[PDB]
Design a binder for this molecule. Structure first.
Ligand SMILES: CCCCCCCC/C=C\CCCCCCCC(=O)OC[C@H](O)CO
Ligand SMILES: CCCCCCCC/C=C\CCCCCCCC(=O)OC[C@H](O)CO
Ligand SMILES: CCCCCCCC/C=C\CCCCCCCC(=O)OC[C@H](O)CO
Ligand SMILES: CCCCCCCCCCCCCCCCCCCC
Ligand SMILES: CCCCCCCCCCCCCCCCCCCC
Ligand SMILES: CCCCCCCCCCCCCCCCCCCC
Ligand SMILES: [Mn+2]
Ligand SMILES: [Mn+2]
Ligand SMILES: [Mn+2]
Ligand SMILES: [Mn+2]
Ligand SMILES: [Mn+2]
Ligand SMILES: [Mn+2]
Ligand SMILES: [Mn+2]
Lengths: 207, 209
């Protein structure tokens, strides 16, 4: 496995989770703390141009995201509230990532098309997840997309981080990552709506 | 009022879902063309017009013997996109043509919370819980932001501060609403019943609530 991957991190979530339980933390409190730290990092570092440090901080709390489930597993189970909270917190965290980067791009760069791309990523990031939740609320399916949420985050965070990379930065990488993610995200939206359409019971007329 | 319009659109060969998509595309085009140019009154009228137009898909579905679950999901998703475009369009004017960086922050809070408020409800329902209620739903959201924007640019007698009053009011009310709806999730029947967490992945050790 890649050394910074979630699959790698899953090899040490059990001792971490046991430690956090021992200290009296719960899964849901950990979800909130990690989300708050992630938002703080994105909204502090990105608007300052510290894109490599921000990307590292955000990626850490993508890994940290995995602790609430590991903790709940050690405690005998999770809850539906915990699942809703995790998902909701992920929406907020993603929103802060794009808002932080947006602040840097809008006010400290000269790339207005890139602002547009960042806004597309921001809105599609929410909508991609909304389609799936809203579909399931109606008893339909709404997943889909060639590229999953963690990998979508990898695209933009890699672009940001390389653009600000220590010693040997490649500034174009931020724009490359954002436009690639914008295109991928728009497509993912259409693909997910197609999954809704092909779900059992999706097009029966009622009432 | 709606029935004759709906029947006419059905005779054209339009369906509820096509009307949803068209109304949303027009609303998005209005917000993203008129708000970035500072035509906030015109943009607000265009957006409100297509809000009223979004009610026609339901009137049409009635005339057709009923709507579909897919149509409901599509309509709700389109509503998110339309709300996104409203705040993006205004953001562009505020960010690049005003000197009010705090207002940019308020606008971004509105942008994100407009999505998250709806998301909490849908995601709660996807788990058999509830996430409804709260101060800000879409009608209150649009009234506040579009009234502030329209008044700020009103013909003859504008009141420029209205844009900022509306955005800050909506920002604060929308954060509160997110907290309210998550409490509603928590109090929902079954929300904290313990559930077995099966491992996901090829190794069945990826654990998620
Ligand atoms: C020197 C250490 C950094 C070297 C690496 C380039 C750094 C790019 C900049 C910031 C990292 C933010 C993104 C980190 C993404 C890692 C994603 C990954 O490892 O892939 C596994 C994933 O869980 C499934 O694909
Ligand atoms: C024209 C002034 C309108 C300002 C409306 C603020 C109050 C609105 C009501 C409740 C929100 C209270 C929270 C206020 C937090 C905002 C503080 C701020 O920074 O105000 C700067 C403003 O953008 C300058 O137009
Ligand atoms: C309860 C859920 C709500 C949580 C929603 C949070 C998501 C982030 C949204 C808006 C903040 C975006 C702020 C962008 C960063 C601004 C940094 C900055 O430099 O501020 C400039 C200063 O005001 C100079 O006047
Ligand atoms: C001077 C800028 C440095 C601020 C770093 C704080 C970032 C917060 C990280 C959250 C953990
Ligand atoms: C002068 C330039 C004006 C730019 C206006 C701001 C552009 C914001 C771009 C994001 C638009 C938000 C709506 C996204 C629509 C995505 C549709 C998803 C497909 C289902
Ligand atoms: C520097 C910016 C810091 C912003 C903090 C962002 C906070 C994100 C986490 C929000 C999580 C919502 C928690 C509310 C839970 C409500 C449950 C009540 C029922 C008991
Ligand atoms: Mn988690
Ligand atoms: Mn998560
Ligand atoms: Mn998830
Ligand atoms: Mn996910
Ligand atoms: Mn409608
Ligand atoms: Mn609608
Ligand atoms: Mn509602």
């Amino acid at each position: 496995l890649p050394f910074l991957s979630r699959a790698a991190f899953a090899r040490i979530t059990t001792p971490i989770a046991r430690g956090l339980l021992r200290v009296g933390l719960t899964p849901d409190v950990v979800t909130i703390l990690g989300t708050t730290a992630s938002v703080a990092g994105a909204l502090t570092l990105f608007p300052m141009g510290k894109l490599f440090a921000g990307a590292c901080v955000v990626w850490f709390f993508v890994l940290f995201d995995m602790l609430d489930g590991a903790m709940a597993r050690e405690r005998g189970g999770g809850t539906r509230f915990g699942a809703v909270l995790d998902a909701t917190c992920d929406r907020i965290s993603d929103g802060a990532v794009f808002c932080g980067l947006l602040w840097w791009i809008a006010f400290h760069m000269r790339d207005r098309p890139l602002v547009i791309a960042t806004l597309i990523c921001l809105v599609t990031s929410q909508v991609i997840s909304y389609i799936k939740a809203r579909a399931e609320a109606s008893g339909l399916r709404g997943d889909g997309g060639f590229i999953e949420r963690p990998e979508r985050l990898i695209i933009v965070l890699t672009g940001a981080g390389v653009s600000d990379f220590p010693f040997v930065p490649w500034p174009p990488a931020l724009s490359v990552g954002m436009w690639l993610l914008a295109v991928a995200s728009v497509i993912t939206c259409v693909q997910r709506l197609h999954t809704v359409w092909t779900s059992p019971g999706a097009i029966d007329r009622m009432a």
